[PDB]
Amino acid sequence: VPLFHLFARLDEELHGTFPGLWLALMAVHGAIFLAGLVLNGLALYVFCCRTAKTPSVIYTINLVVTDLLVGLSLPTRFAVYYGARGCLRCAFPHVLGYFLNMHCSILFLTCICVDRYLAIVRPEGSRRCRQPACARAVCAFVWLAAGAVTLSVLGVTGSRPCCRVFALTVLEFLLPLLVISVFTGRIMCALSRPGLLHQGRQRRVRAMQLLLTVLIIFLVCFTPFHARQVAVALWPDMPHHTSLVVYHVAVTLSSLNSCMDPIVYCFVTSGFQATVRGL
Amino acid sequence: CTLSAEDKAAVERSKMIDRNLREDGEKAAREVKLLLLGAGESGKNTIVKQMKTGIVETHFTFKDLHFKMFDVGAQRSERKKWIHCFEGVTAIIFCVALSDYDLMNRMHESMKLFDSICNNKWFTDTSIILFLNKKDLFEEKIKKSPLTICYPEYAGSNTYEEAAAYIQCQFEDLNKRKDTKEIYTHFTCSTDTKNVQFVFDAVTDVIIKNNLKDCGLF
Amino acid sequence: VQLVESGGGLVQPGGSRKLSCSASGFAFSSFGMHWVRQAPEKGLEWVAYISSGSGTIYYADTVKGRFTISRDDPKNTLFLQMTSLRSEDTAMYYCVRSIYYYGSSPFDFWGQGTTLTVSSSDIVMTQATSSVPVTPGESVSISCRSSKSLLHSNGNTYLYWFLQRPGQSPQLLIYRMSNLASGVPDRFSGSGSGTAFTLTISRLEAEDVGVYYCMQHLEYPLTFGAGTKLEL
Amino acid sequence: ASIAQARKLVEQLKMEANIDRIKVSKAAADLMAYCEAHAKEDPLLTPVPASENPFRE
Amino acid sequence: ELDQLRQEAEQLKNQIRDARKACADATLSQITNNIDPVGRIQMRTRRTLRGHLAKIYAMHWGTDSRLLVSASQDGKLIIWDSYTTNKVHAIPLRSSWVMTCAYAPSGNYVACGGLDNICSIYNLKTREGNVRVSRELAGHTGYLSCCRFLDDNQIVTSSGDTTCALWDIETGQQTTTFTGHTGDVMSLSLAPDTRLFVSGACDASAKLWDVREGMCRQTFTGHESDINAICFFPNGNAFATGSDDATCRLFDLRADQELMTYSHDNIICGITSVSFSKSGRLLLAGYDDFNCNVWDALKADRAGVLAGHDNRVSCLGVTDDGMAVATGSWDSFLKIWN
């Protein structure tokens, strides 16, 4: 073998063989925990208790729910490591933060981008009764899919080239990346259609700038983990210190999504920003 | 269960009635409703004529969009007691004659009505497709009658090119909620066959802005 | 309104025939329709039923599976495609409109009906009398006894009265045991409760001569009654 | 012009004067008496038992 | 002359005010101060009729107190069965702008009307099985705000042209026209004997109209803004109006003056609908702060809040048997409180 034993062993060995890197890791994790909870907490308070129920609001509400829950689970890794030393069989719930930050959060971004494509360029009769009820239905289905995918990838078959050392990588960095990229490209093509009024050019510029910012954040927050997951499969020739420092740098960079996702999905919204300013 | 045959058949009838009601609402949800609120017959009839009692309704389809124009001016009642029936309209197509600046003045009352519509509680986020209608007569009469008759504070010249710009900026001045509402001014000619084209462009921009606002991009 | 009937004729046993009931005049799409047979020497009998918009569809126990019934709202026509004929289906088939809402009058109008001659837990309702000689101007009471009480928990007894003048289709007289159907004189008055029901005629004339039937409407296997024929 | 409407207004106000008026005390007494005499069968002042309530949730 | 007539006009107004003041000796609170208060009253949403897709603008209970009709801006006129939830009829209106509706006492007819300045009478009990238009009453030069059925052949309509009219369905013409209002007439309510009625208008005055004689009989002032709602007391010797200045007022027919002022310091919104209880003790008022309110009609105290609506309440109605009160709000739904 199961992989979470390997992640616990990698964390323990990085603690053993790198004091300064571990100290920087705790500092970065604490900074993200401080920054990634107040912003997400304010966003959830001003959506779930201040605001009309559009499907994008439901999607970003469950997204910030996952973000706050994995912010809570971020110190759980350190707490389980410090308190319950050893007993790798005990080490499931703290290492299950990859279910929240990396597994369930990534394709909620794709769900939001799918909704944005479905609403901007072509409603198609309101997506044949899109509706908040079916929005929650897709939310429940995607929750079940994320739970099923996250459970099997830990101990499927073993070895570097086979099992989920590459299967999880492709499953959560090829389908989500291609879906987000192609739908952002289609929306940017739609919003630059030639024959639109010059009065509304200023809003569409900010719209595709926001879409490109979301794509850049996704590409910079989740690429090193899967890149190193590919690297440890193809070329074992690099040694263990690089394979641990790159792994923890990538994990921290994926934890930076807890601070950059909710600001770029909630604070940049003009209506939500005006609501927060007026209250 | 615990329902007899008549109650079961009544439930079936109500289910079918709700089905047709939902279908009618879905049909009417995709159709654009415009409020045509002119001032003192300053080009209402001409605008209705070049394209396409109480409330006069006009519906016309223009290249994959169904429009609905509600001519209102034949009411002569308290506007505040029924103007809340027009919440959720896609736009408020105004109509102002430029030639009525030297007619207490008609243009001043048009400005008063425009201020009363912009600064309205119900229309706090509906865009206004302002239609400066009579530009030919304004062009002919601007050489003889200066704009100082209507605007004593005007500092520009007599030419129509800057006088029309001054009228447009003065009409956009009375807007206060500039962050939500956008006024799509246009100048209408007798041979202008693109007034419906400009209405389509403004309505598509309004729909795009509404979709961006709902999606969180705006 | 109108309901003109086409079909019938000599049908061999085990064959198939298709009865067209083409409505004309009223909103056919909003009206649940039935079929009611009538043997040449017996009383009325139920056949089938389609709800509005071709939804729920029921059948009698005798004709289940052999009969299929369909409607066509485009052409305002409703059909009865019946298979596996035998000598027990020799009857005259009336299509009866019936619209169900609160306060409506089901079975108000009956079609003309085409006779069909074939070559060779039901709530039973009992009317012991079968022929009541009487003079005009005399008050007449016709009794109808059921096996299960029709009084639902809502508070309305779903018992119906019909009148079949000799030579024409039945017409609804009393609906839900206490409500006068529109278009009938006020002399008719039905009453009763539970399982015992009677219909009291105040004054009798020459147009009241005809057979009097009963309908239950609790569950959709509706059972008719042995008609008590009125005559001078 | 602006004369006929004044004439009919003053005539209506003149014929408003001879309207019979009763004491406010006895009118309030009648209001209260009708209010209490019909309060027994009123299903608003007195919450009816749920057995005979037709809106049984 | 204008001032010459105005002299005795203001003299007559002063005489009327003096007579009204001289006829008052004690307030309604001073009389019914020793009566046991009604106490707190709780209301629960027994039924929630949904199916409209626009703002609901009017509602009327049937005489049988089981059928009710609702008018909304999508162009539908839904007739609800209130004991169950299911609908009965769905009538597509010719003009989507409707601001009033009515139910006939016999239940055979349902009225509508709105910004089209035309009252439409719908024949529910047709041999053809569909709801038709029995008559399309035209002749008003303004929006219709309230129409009430006198009987199966007469309807009293109140329009926005400062006039109320009595119609004849078969002929289609105005039998009587009630002139005397200066502002837009906004609401209407007939007497229990249907021989008098009162109309409230935007000039903060309600007049008692004789539907048989044809002229106004009494004038009731006191409000500070538009009167959006009016309703007779069940005795017929009083009526209660709800205006736009967050105040419901009780007027007396025989005392011809103020009786009560049902106002609270915590409400600054505008009453949109007013209805009375069966015994005349609970005056229900549909406010603009998103919820209805209950007032003890004999005291001045409150009794409860019918807070169950997303948008504002536009129509209110208490059944003829007095079992329930239905509030239809602007969002999409009517709630049958009981």
Residue numbers in the entry:
A (entry chain R): 32 to 82, 84 to 311
B (entry chain A): 3 to 54, 182 to 232, 240 to 354
C (entry chain S): 2 to 121, 124 to 235
D (entry chain C): 7 to 63
E (entry chain B): 3 to 340
What do the authors report?
GPR20 is a class-A orphan G protein-coupled receptor (GPCR) and a potential therapeutic target for gastrointestinal stromal tumors (GIST) owing to its differentially high expression. GPR20 constitutively activates Gi proteins in the absence of any known ligand, but it remains obscure how this high basal activity is achieved. Here we report the atomic-resolution structures of the ligand-free human orphan GPR20 in the Gi-coupled states in the absence or presence of the Fab fragment of Ab046 (hereafter named as GPR20-Gi and GPR20-Gi-Fab046 respectively) as well as in the Gi-free state (GPR20-Fab046) using single particle cryo-electron microscopy technique (cryo-EM). These structures reveal a uniquely folded N-terminal α-helix (cap) of GPR20 that might be essential in conferring the receptor’s constitutive activity.
The overall structures of the GPR20-Gi-Fab046 complex and GPR20-Gi complex are nearly identical with root mean square deviation (RMSD) values of 0.71 Å for the whole GPR20-Gi complex and 0.70 Å for the receptor alone, which is consistent with our BRET results that Ab046 is a non-functional antibody for GPR20.
